[PDB]
């Protein structure tokens, strides 16, 4: 019956592919062909924060559009004031192998993880002054690659042992566990209403989970290599992935298929980060070629570059009001564009 | 042994295959409608004057 | 005046070949590079050479003046002190570079444990201080003689000449020679036998360049000390000093090519920036 | 009115960060690799995600990293150890896959100028086995006598023939685990590597 | 539990001297700034001295410069010399931390009774009030309290009878930690007011208002809601 079940799975995959392809009557580029282009958009460096000493692996924006948190492999995590370049906090870590960081929406907690398979929570509003460790979650057998807050009580983490879990910072116990991927899960993104999230595994696929039920709903397979970044459209109806095949793609949740592909002949290096614009017209991507290419999301064409980095770009982000964009790199430098 | 794994796989495929779908053109229409309805307030594709720049 | 015009031609060539390279080196090493232990020496040497390169038009004006000075006493007392400070700072920075290379070659443990930026900054400050100390006497003793007003010097003269000769010539040359000889001696065994030849070539080039560029100044100073002015064979000295000092000043343009752009990263950054 | 105090606090924490970095710049880091049950435990004990061991020998603060617990693809986390001073390799003579691991590690993109220290252990067991069984089973192509020294030299030559970059060197030493001379070998190799790196940095190499 | 204990006061003849101490525990003493606030037995509060975090910067009042000294183990000192008859007042120990989003003047001390042998105006000095009603107190300022960055510095304190003052509203709009939701504050430039909703028997005392723009800190006369 094993061969029969394999044949049934193959025929189900064929049916799914036929159904997905039967709904593609037209193309996005055809419909957005009669729209004036955005033109040239050159951005100039305004500020430059230089506090770290090693490669920067993650960054995040506060909900106030003023405070930012940076995590570097020197064993430290700082909190920046972007309007003044002043430093507010400096938290020493226990394990120097850090690969992720997060900022609570309320502004009271931060999170950190890495090669130690343990995710930490820090309290920033202590009565006695300094910052103390509030929790230490440990349930993963593989390196943790991403962690994103839901509220002040719960957090969702993605690990390298092909599993995703939803925790509870009050007790430190796994409420739910998501399984099904084949390789390492290296990316995560949460919906605007924080009821759904997507992840990108290393077996060249991406799935759409849901927090309440702990199940999977759809899978999008259209890439050629591993997936290292993911982000959500501001309307929460689409998400754009960035792989190591030097191509970024746009997937539609309702259409259950890809819509447009952003690539060019010259680009060879893979993509390490991806981010959208607040109104959804631009799409900035970070490249291993030390540059950042600003794309016109509705026309699949370039609109400018962001030069000024001496090494690979590791992280990029846009504020909540869309007034600024910040990038980090392996040379221990962060720049604020405008 | 592997019978349970195969049953789980086919059940997952059955659950995934039962999802409704909309037209691609309608999705594109919604997308560009969102991008044009909010175009006048984006501070990146329209350069805000330096008088209103916190980063000046 | 074939000697005077030859010295002027040498000065013009030195200026034209020195300004672009030192400006580019200064820009790259102070704006396009991070602060490291080895970068401080290059930065300070570039600063000294650039300060030296800003006095060449004054030298051309003085050559055109032909032993006259209608200005006041302050400028005559001042400018040569600045020029001497620049030259001696460059020389001492070269010696410090050689000693640093020898030290990192011979002592790995102590260099690993106790080498940082602060020591380099302190050494550079001490070098600048000793350059200032060496440059005081010209500011003290320069004056104007009034046929017509001409800028010229008045036991002390012998003391200044001898101390300048010894400190500027005999000690730095010995230090660099010993350091490079011991480095070549160390590189015979192990994995270093495949680059001993290149190291020997580079050491020979730098030592020979320094010794050809700085020696005639001291030779002529000593010879003018031994020979009376009114006696014959002295007009030769009084005439070709100009070319002697021009040869001494050519080191300002020569140094950046020898030192700064021998590193692959420096060459890559310079090519990318231009 | 009170932003000057915030500026003072920022300057103070910046100074503390600089002092911490200067203090931490002095350590020497070594990566530790090898196959499963290859004797790495014997060497680390002779003096869950990752295990760190530190000890001091002649005013040198070593740090050994063990990554044996990471049962994932090595291409996803190998860039974190790009700045290691050297790589220690252990091989069990009394036993193919080690050759593939050595080939993959030596020709990595991030390890084009990193020296490798090779340790050959279980020499006594290899000698007893060669007294009992020949060396032709593990190497069907090897031809010549059945002596211990020739077999050891052939194995070392086979391991060394996997390096192509002229800028890196491989140090090889034969161990029997009944000794305490590993620290001296590591010290000598590290001193040579430090001297070579210092010379290359200055520009005379 | 955060504690700040001070002692060292007593009867002194004129022309003498005395040493005061402020022992602190339960918090990171090395990352805070310390103040000194006195209150005459029949008058309002008055600023005395300030020492920054790390002894970097020190400030003194107008009528104590050259006679007092502030120093900071985990203990703070205050050396006073040439004690005249106008120094008879209890001295409090006040902590404050300064960074983006901090709340200075958080926790006050207990005070030591020492016995010796911008003009910010609060017009109203007494109001008649009963439980269950709503009351409001207002105090003005001579100079505008809005800086270029858009921040206004008005603080409101409450001193229950026989107790120590506790911070209520900082920067004219922000409610402190632990304060109930009844209190609220508003103002514009030079005129400020505070509102109390559903007054109970646990909110009876005297109120003070204070600025933090010019470091010669000045309080208000004070209003007693009896
Ligand atoms: C240091 C110095 C510099 C001088 C000239 C000058 C510089 C560069 C060139 Cl290419 C040409 C002229 C100059 C003057 C004015 C100004 Cl604003 C700028 C530069 S003259 C001088 C000095 O000290 N001369 C003594 C002794 C040194 C001579 N060598 C002997 N005796 N062996 C002397 O009178 O003999």
Q: What is the CATH number of the domain that holds E71?
A: 2.60.40.10
Contact: A87, D76; criterion CB under 8 Å:
no
Q: Are A205 and A221 in contact (CB under 8 A)?
A: yes
- To the nearest 10°, the Cα dihedral for C48, C54, C56, C60? -160
Q: E136 and E37, same structural domain?
A: no
What distance in Å separates the CA atoms of residue E109 and residue E96, rounded to the nearest whole number? 12
Q: E130 and E25, same structural domain?
A: no
Residue E137 φ then ψ, to 5°: -130, 140
Residue A156 φ then ψ, to 5°: -120, 130
Contact: A186, D77; criterion CB under 8 Å:
no
- To the nearest 10°, the Cα dihedral for E217, E223, E225, E226? 120
Indicate the DSSP class of residue A223: -
**Ligand 1 binding pocket includes C249 (Cβ within 6 Å):** yes
Long-range CB pairs of C130-137, under 8 A, 24+ apart, other chains included:
C130/C88, C130/C92, C131/C85, C131/C86, C131/C88, C131/C89, C131/C92, C132/C85, C134/C84, C134/C85, C134/C88, C134/C164, C134/C167, C135/C81, C135/C82, C135/C84, C135/C85, C135/C88, C136/C81
Last residue of a domain, one of E101, E116, E131: E116
- Domain that residue E98 falls in: 3-116
Architecture of the domain made up of C2-273: Up-down Bundle (1.20)
Q: E81 and E14, same structural domain?
A: yes
Nearest to E56 among D2, D3, D8 (CB): D8
**Closest residue, chain A, to B23 (C-alpha):** A23
Q: E189 and E92, same structural domain?
A: no
Task: Please list, in sequence order, all residues whose beta carbon lies within 8 angstroms of the beta carbon of residue C251, skipping any fewer than 6 positions away.
Answer: C90, C210, C213, C214
Give the bridge partners for A232, in sequence order.
A239
Distances (CA, A) of D172 to D160, D183, E33: 9, 14, 61
Q: Are A217 and A223 in contact (CB under 8 A)?
A: no
What distance in Å separates the CA atoms of residue B55 and residue A83, rounded to the nearest whole number? 7
What distance in Å separates the CA atoms of residue A198 and residue A60, rounded to the nearest whole number? 18
What distance in Å separates the CA atoms of residue A60 and residue A46, rounded to the nearest whole number? 19
What distance in Å separates the CA atoms of residue B25 and residue C134, rounded to the nearest whole number? 83
Chain A interface test: which of E101, E106, E167, E176 (most A C-beta within 10 Å): E101
Instruction: State in Å: Cα C242 to ligand 1 middle.
Output: 7
Kind of pairing between the strands at D115-121 and D170-174:
parallel
Q: E139 and E102, same structural domain?
A: no
Alpha carbons within 13 angstroms on the beta-carbon side of residue A15 total: 13
Residue C124 φ then ψ, to 5°: -65, -40
Residue A50 φ then ψ, to 5°: -130, 90
Instruction: State in Å: Cα C136 to ligand 1 middle.
Output: 16
Q: E189 and E88, same structural domain?
A: no
Residue A274 φ then ψ, to 5°: -145, 145
Distances (CA, A) of A171 to A18, A139, A175: 46, 13, 10
Residue A256 φ then ψ, to 5°: 60, 35
Q: Are E68 and E176 in contact (CB under 8 A)?
A: no
Q: Are E18 and E7 in contact (CB under 8 A)?
A: no
* Kind plus residue range of the DSSP H or E element containing D3: helix D3-24
**Ligand 1 binding pocket includes C218 (Cβ within 6 Å):** no
What distance in Å separates the CA atoms of residue B8 and residue A334, rounded to the nearest whole number? 47
**Ligand 1 binding pocket includes C79 (Cβ within 6 Å):** yes
Q: Using a CB-CB distance cutoff of 8 angstroms, which residues of chain A are in contact with residue B3?
A: 1-2, 5
Indicate the DSSP class of residue A270: P
User: Which strand ranges, in their side-by-side order, compose the sheet holding E126-127?
Assistant: E126-127, E223-225, E205-211, E154-159, E166-170, E174-175
Which two tokens mark E14?
């004129």
Q: E85 and E103, same structural domain?
A: yes
Resolution in angstroms for this experimental structure? 3.3
Distances (CA, A) of B17 to A20, A250, D125: 10, 21, 60
Number of domains in chain B: 1
Contact: E52, D1; criterion CB under 8 Å:
no
Domains annotated on chain A, with CATH:
1-338 (2.130.10.10)
Last residue of a domain, one of E116, E149, E171: E116
Q: E28 and E78, same structural domain?
A: yes
> Residue B43 is part of a domain; what is its CATH number?
4.10.260.10
Q: CA gyration radius for chain C?
A: 21
Q: Are D64 and D27 in contact (CB under 8 A)?
A: no
Residues in chain C: 274
Other beta carbons less than 10 A from residue C161's beta carbon: 15
**Ligand 1 binding pocket includes C135 (Cβ within 6 Å):** no
What distance in Å separates the CA atoms of residue C103 and residue A295, rounded to the nearest whole number? 53
Q: CA gyration radius for chain A?
A: 20
Number of domains in chain E: 2
Q: E127 and E65, same structural domain?
A: no
Nearest to E28 among A86, A88, A129 (CB): A129
- Domain that residue B24 falls in: 3-55
Q: Using a CB-CB distance cutoff of 8 angstroms, which residues of chain D are in contact with residue C104?
A: 198-199, 202
Using beta carbons and an 8 Å cutoff, which residues of A are at the interface with D?
51, 53, 73-74, 76, 84, 86-90, 95, 97, 115-118, 142-143, 160-161, 183-184, 186, 202
In terms of C-beta density within 10 A (0-12 exposed, 13-18 middle, 19 or more buried), how is residue E179 classed? middle
The domains of chain D are located at: 25-196
Other beta carbons less than 10 A from residue C86's beta carbon: 23
What distance in Å separates the CA atoms of residue A242 and residue E102, rounded to the nearest whole number? 40
Angle between helices C235-259 and C56-65 (to 10 degrees): 170
Nearest to D169 among C109, C191, C202 (CB): C191
Contact: A142, D50; criterion CB under 8 Å:
no
Q: Identify the CA nearest to E209 among candidates E157, E142, E135.
A: E157
In terms of C-beta density within 10 A (0-12 exposed, 13-18 middle, 19 or more buried), how is residue C1 classed? exposed
What distance in Å separates the CA atoms of residue D78 and residue A62, rounded to the nearest whole number? 31
| CATH level 3 topology of D25-196 | Rossmann fold (3.40.50)
Indicate the DSSP class of residue C125: H
Give the bridge partners for E206, in sequence order.
E159, E224
User: Which strand ranges, in their side-by-side order, compose the sheet holding A282-287?
Assistant: A271-276, A282-287, A292-296, A301-305
Last residue of a domain, one of E116, E140, E162: E116
Q: E164 and E224, same structural domain?
A: yes
Q: Are E206 and E220 in contact (CB under 8 A)?
A: no
**Ligand 1 binding pocket includes C254 (Cβ within 6 Å):** no
Helix, strand, or coil here: D168?
Answer: coil
Indicate the DSSP class of residue D75: G
* Kind plus residue range of the DSSP H or E element containing A242: strand A238-243
Distance from CA of C199 to the nearest CA of D (A): 6
**End-to-end Cα, chain D, rounded Å:** 56
What distance in Å separates the CA atoms of residue E31 and residue E15, rounded to the nearest whole number? 36
**Ligand 1 binding pocket includes C142 (Cβ within 6 Å):** no
Q: Are E185 and E174 in contact (CB under 8 A)?
A: no
- To the nearest 10°, the Cα dihedral for E38, E40, E46, E47? -30
HEC string for chain E: CCEEEEECCCCECCCCEEEEEEEEECCCHHHCEEEEEEECCCCCEEEEEEECCCCCCEEECCCCCCCEEEECCCEEEEEEECCCHHHCEEEEEEEECCCCCCCCCCCECCCEEECECCCEECCCCEECCCCCCCEEEEEEECCCCECCCCCECEEEEEECCCCCCEEEEECCCEECCCCCCCCEEEEECCEEEEEECCCCCCCCEEEEEEECCCCCCCECCCEEEC
Q: Using a CB-CB distance cutoff of 8 angstroms, which residues of chain D are in contact with residue E59?
A: none
**Ligand 1 binding pocket includes C186 (Cβ within 6 Å):** no
Q: Identify the CA nearest to E170 among candidates E79, E217, E214, E106.
A: E106
Distance from the Cα of residue D162 to its chain's centroid? 16
What distance in Å separates the CA atoms of residue A293 and residue A277, rounded to the nearest whole number? 13
């Amino acid at each position: 019956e094993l061969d029969q079940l394999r044949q049934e799975a193959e025929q189900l995959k064929n049916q799914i592919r036929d159904a997905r392809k039967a709904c593609a009557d037209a193309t996005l580029s055809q419909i957005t062909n009669n729209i004036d282009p955005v033109g040239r958009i050159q951005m100039r460096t305004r500020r430059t924060l230089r506090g770290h000493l090693a490669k920067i692996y993650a960054m995040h924006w506060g909900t106030d559009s003023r405070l930012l948190v940076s995590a570097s492999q020197d064993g430290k995590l700082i909190i920046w004031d972007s309007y003044t370049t002043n430093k507010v906090h400096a938290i020493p870590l226990r394990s120097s192998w850090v690969m992720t960081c997060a900022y609570a929406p309320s502004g009271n907690y931060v999170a950190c993880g890495g090669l130690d398979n343990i995710c930490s929570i820090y309290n920033l509003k202590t009565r006695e002054g300094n910052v103390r460790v509030s929790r230490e979650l440990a349930g993963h057998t593989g390196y943790l690659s991403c962690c994103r807050f839901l509220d002040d009580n719960q957090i969702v983490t993605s690990s390298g042992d092909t599993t995703c879990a939803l925790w509870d910072i009050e007790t430190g116990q796994q409420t739910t566990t998501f399984t099904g991927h084949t390789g390492d899960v290296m990316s995560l993104s949460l919906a605007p209403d924080t009821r759904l999230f997507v992840s990108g595994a290393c077996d060249a696929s991406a799935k759409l989970w849901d927090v309440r039920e702990g199940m999977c709903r759809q899978t999008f397979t259209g890439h050629e290599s591993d997936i290292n970044a993911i982000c959500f459209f501001p309307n929460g109806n689409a998400f754009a992935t960035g792989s190591d095949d030097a191509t970024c793609r746009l997937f539609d949740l309702r259409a259950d298929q890809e819509l447009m592909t952003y690539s060019h002949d010259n680009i060879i290096c893979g993509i390490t980060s991806v981010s959208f614009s607040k109104s959804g017209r631009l799409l900035l991507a970070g490249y291993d070629d030390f540059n950042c290419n600003v794309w016109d999301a509705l026309k699949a064409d370039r609109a400018g570059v962001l030069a000024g980095h001496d090494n690979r770009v590791s992280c990029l982000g846009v504020t909540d009001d869309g007034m600024a964009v910040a990038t980090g790199s392996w040379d221990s430098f962060l720049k604020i564009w405008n | 042994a592997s019978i349970a794994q195969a049953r789980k796989l086919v059940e997952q495929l059955k659950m995934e295959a039962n999802i409704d779908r909309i037209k691609v053109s309608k999705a594109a229409a919604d997308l560009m409608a969102y991008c044009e309805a909010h175009a006048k307030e984006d501070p990146l594709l329209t350069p805000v004057p330096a008088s209103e720049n916190p980063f000046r | 005046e074939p000697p005077v015009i030859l010295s002027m031609v040498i000065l013009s060539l030195t200026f034209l070949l020195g300004l672009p390279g030192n400006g580019l080196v200064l820009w790259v090493a102070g704006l396009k590079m991070q602060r490291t232990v080895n970068t401080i020496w290059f930065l300070h040497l570039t600063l000294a050479d650039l300060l030296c390169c800003l006095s060449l038009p004054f030298s051309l004006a003085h050559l055109a003046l032909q032993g006259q000075w209608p200005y006041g006493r302050f400028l005559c007392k001042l400018i040569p002190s600045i020029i001497v400070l620049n030259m001696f700072a460059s020389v001492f920075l070269l010696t410090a570079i050689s000693l640093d290379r020898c030290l990192v070659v011979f002592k790995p443990i102590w260099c690993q444990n106790h080498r940082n930026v602060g020591m380099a900054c302190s050494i550079c400050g001490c070098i600048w201080v000793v350059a200032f100390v060496m440059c005081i006497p010209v500011f003290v003793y320069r004056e104007i003689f009034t046929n017509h007003n001409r800028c010229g010097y008045k036991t002390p003269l012998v003391a200044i000449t001898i101390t300048r000769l010894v400190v500027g010539f005999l000690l730095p040359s010995v230090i660099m020679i010993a350091c490079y000889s011991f480095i070549v001696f160390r590189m015979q065994r192990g994995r270093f036998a495949k680059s001993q030849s290149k190291t020997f070539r580079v050491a020979v080039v730098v030592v020979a360049v320094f010794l050809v560029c700085w020696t005639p100044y001291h030779i002529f100073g000593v010879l003018s000390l031994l020979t009376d002015p009114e006696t014959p064979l002295g007009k030769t000295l009084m005439s070709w000093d100009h070319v002697c000092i021009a040869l001494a000043s050519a080191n300002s343009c020569f140094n950046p090519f020898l030192y700064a752009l021998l590193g692959k990263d420096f060459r890559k950054k310079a090519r990318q920036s231009i | 009115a009170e932003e000057r105090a915030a500026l003072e606090r920022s300057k103070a924490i910046e100074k503390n960060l600089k002092e911490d970095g200067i203090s931490a710049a002095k350590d020497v880091k070594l990566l530790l690799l090898g196959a499963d049950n290859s004797g790495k435990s014997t060497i680390v004990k002779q003096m869950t995600g990752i295990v760190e061991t530190h000890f001091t020998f002649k005013n040198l603060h070593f740090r050994l990293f063990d990554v044996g617990g990471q049962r994932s693809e090595r291409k996803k986390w190998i860039h974190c150890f790009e700045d290691v001073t050297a790589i220690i390799f252990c091989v069990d003579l009394s036993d193919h896959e080690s050759l593939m691991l050595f080939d993959s590690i030596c020709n990595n993109k991030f390890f084009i100028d990193t020296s490798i220290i090779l340790f050959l252990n279980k020499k006594d067991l290899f000698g007893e086995k060669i007294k009992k069984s020949p060396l032709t089973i593990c190497f069907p192509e090897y031809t010549g006598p059945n002596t211990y020294e020739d077999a050891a030299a052939y194995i070392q030559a086979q391991f060394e023939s996997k390096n192509r970059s002229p800028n890196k060197e491989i140090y090889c030493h034969m161990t029997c685990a009944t000794d305490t001379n590993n620290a001296q070998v590591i010290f000598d190799a590290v001193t040579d590597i430090i001297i070579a790196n210092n010379l290359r940095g200055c520009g005379l190499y | 539990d955060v504690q700040l204990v001070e002692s060292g006061g007593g009867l002194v003849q004129p022309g003498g001297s005395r040493k005061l101490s402020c022992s602190a525990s339960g918090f990171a003493f090395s990352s805070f700034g310390m103040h000194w606030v006195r209150q005459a037995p029949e008058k309002g509060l008055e600023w005395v001295a300030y020492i920054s975090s790390g002894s970097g910067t020190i400030y003194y009042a107008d009528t104590v410069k050259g006679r007092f000294t502030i120093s900071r183990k985990n203990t703070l000192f205050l050396q006073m010399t040439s004690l005249r008859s106008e120094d008879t007042a209890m001295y409090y120990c006040v902590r404050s931390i300064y960074y983006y989003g901090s709340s200075p003047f958080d926790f006050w001390g207990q005070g030591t009774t020492l016995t010796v042998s911008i003009v910010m105006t609060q017009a109203t000095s007494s109001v008649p009030v009963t439980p269950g009603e709503s009351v409001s107190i207002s105090c003005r300022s001579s100079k505008s309290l809005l800086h270029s960055n858009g921040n206004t510095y008005l603080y409101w304190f409450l001193q229950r009878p026989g107790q120590s003052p506790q911070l209520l509203i900082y920067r004219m709009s922000n409610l402190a930690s632990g304060v109930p939701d009844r209190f609220s504050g508003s103002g514009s430039g030079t005129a400020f007011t505070l509102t109390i909703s559903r007054l109970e028997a646990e909110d009876v005392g005297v109120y003070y208002c204070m600025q933090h723009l010019e470091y010669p800190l000045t309080f208000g006369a004070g209003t007693k809601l009896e």
